[PDB]
Amino acid sequence: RRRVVITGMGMLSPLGLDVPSSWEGILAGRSGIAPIEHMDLSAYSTRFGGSVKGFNVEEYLSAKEARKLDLFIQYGLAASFQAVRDSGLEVTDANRERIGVSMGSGIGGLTNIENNCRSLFEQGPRRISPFFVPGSIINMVSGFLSIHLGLQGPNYALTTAATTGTHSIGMAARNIAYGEADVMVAGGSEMAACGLGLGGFGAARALSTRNDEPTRASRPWDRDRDGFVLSDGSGALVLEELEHARARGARIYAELVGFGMSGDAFHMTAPPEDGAGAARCMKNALRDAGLDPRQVDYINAHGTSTPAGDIAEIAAVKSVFGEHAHALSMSSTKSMTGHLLGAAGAVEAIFSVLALRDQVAPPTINLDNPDEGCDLDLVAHEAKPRKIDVALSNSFGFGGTNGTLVFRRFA
């Protein structure tokens, strides 16, 4: 089985329009959460979220091309273009069949759907945009990236709710490991802040309603948590076979050593109280990496700020790591970014890789009063410089679909 390394990273998040600006916010404990400006939400129970501020699509695409694409596609292409530039890779006739794309989304083009739905109900079907389908379907980040850069390798898209970015990266790594590609651009994107998004998650009572203090709403493992915060953006990584990277003198950030999956097979939105599914998934990833639990230094948690979810993840980490659960550091960067849904696993993979580069555990902000049994090192309030050789990233999605990635300092 071939080794897979990370040679390029790209991002849009509520904290920044690139990786270095986002990471500066993470290490400073900055919130990207604010009242939403782009629609009137006076009728909604949640009126805040994590928006991308000041995005200029014309840095990436012509105004002509951009007009045809939903925001989630613009965001996915921005992160992908950043990652490919960051990698330094040159695409040629000799390698274009060996370079593929796996960029996913949880909910896809809900804004475009809403806008075309308005035209349809008011004025009938002949008002629908000709670009409605190709500019809204989830696989068009992978499609449009492949067309723009001439990538002819495996071309697909995952949609697994909060697990999307984690599955996208893990399965792209499998393509490289088993020899069906040498390079993959993998990750996810999301822009679900429309009436149907805030209204839909609101109707399921999944969202924090702390409208008076939006920056305090996302509070993983805190006793006063009341649901997740909806956020927008994108993450992309260039995954590359090790000898391919070495041959061209690529800068290597870290090694992707492990990928695990499981299903809870329990409930449509609630985890089992002991997080048994999450425990199996983390053990599967560590076994894939050939690592003992005692070798893990940092966990980037799922940690969405939900009553049932946050405590199930603690139970799963205690089950897998035993006494070592009190030696590792675990934090939820969703305390600062909110929940990017299909992009969460992509941006959190990048944060896990930068924790390895910079030897620092990002904080869990807003952890004022840890709940019953939440007695691990959850890196409350402030970043913690420490030794990190192995970093684990968890994603648990609606339906009980679980994914874990394991990254290692490269040697």
Ligand X SMILES: CC(C)NC(=O)c1cc[nH]n1
Residues that bind a copy of itself (CB under 8 A): 42-43, 45, 56, 58-59, 62-64, 205, 209
338 near ligand X, judged by CB under 6 A:
no
| Shortest spacing between CB 264 and ligand X, in angstroms | 6
Burial call 294-331: b when 16+ CB within 10 Å, e when fewer:
eebbbbbbbbbbbeebbbbbbbbbbbbbeeebeebbbb
Name which of residues 276 to 295 contact ligand X (CB under 6 A).
Answer: 277-278
| Shortest spacing between CB 59 and a copy of itself, in angstroms | 6
Question: 236 is in the binding site of which of ligand X, a copy of itself, none (Cβ under 5 to 8 A by kind)?
Answer: none
- The residues facing 369 across adjacent strands are none
Evaluate whether 66 touches 79 at the Cβ level (below 8 Å): no
| Shortest spacing between CB 209 and a copy of itself, in angstroms | 6
Q: How many residues bind ligand X (CB under 6 A)?
A: 15
Contacts of residue 233, defined as CB under 8 A and 6 or more positions apart, other chains included, come to 11, 12, 13, 14, 50, 52, 75, 79, 189, 190, 337, 340, 343, 347
Q: Which is nearer to ligand X, 244 or 280 (CB)?
A: 280
| Shortest spacing between CB 188 and ligand X, in angstroms | 16
313 near ligand X, judged by CB under 6 A:
yes
How far is 13 from 8, CA to CA, in rounded Å? 17
Evaluate whether 407 touches 254 at the Cβ level (below 8 Å): yes
275 near ligand X, judged by CB under 6 A:
yes
CA distances to 217, 316, 408 from 147, in Å: 40, 42, 33
How far is 15 from 13, CA to CA, in rounded Å? 5
Q: Which is nearer to a copy of itself, 63 or 247 (CB)?
A: 63
Question: 153 is in the binding site of which of ligand X, a copy of itself, none (Cβ under 5 to 8 A by kind)?
Answer: none
Q: Which is nearer to a copy of itself, 212 or 323 (CB)?
A: 212
Question: 45 is in the binding site of which of a copy of itself, ligand X, none (Cβ under 5 to 8 A by kind)?
Answer: a copy of itself
Burial call 109-134: b when 16+ CB within 10 Å, e when fewer:
bbbbbebbeeeeeeeeeeeeeeebee
Q: Which DSSP category does 44 fall into?
A: S
Question: 205 is in the binding site of which of ligand X, a copy of itself, none (Cβ under 5 to 8 A by kind)?
Answer: a copy of itself
| Contacting residue, 184, 230, 239, 316, with ligand X by CB under 6 A | 316
How far is 244 from 265, CA to CA, in rounded Å? 39
| Contacting residue, 32, 109, 220, 271, with ligand X by CB under 6 A | 271
260 near ligand X, judged by CB under 6 A:
no
403 near ligand X, judged by CB under 6 A:
no
Query: SS3 for 9?
Result: strand
348 near ligand X, judged by CB under 6 A:
no
Amino acid in position 90: E
400 near ligand X, judged by CB under 6 A:
yes
Could you tell me whether strands 33-35 and 48-50 are parallel, antiparallel, or unpaired per DSSP bridges? antiparallel
What would the DSSP string read from start to end of 140-155?
A: HHHHHHHHHHT--S-E
Q: Which is nearer to a copy of itself, 210 or 408 (CB)?
A: 210
- Interaction site with ligand X (CB under 6 A): 269, 271, 275, 277-278, 302, 306, 309, 312-313, 316, 396-398, 400
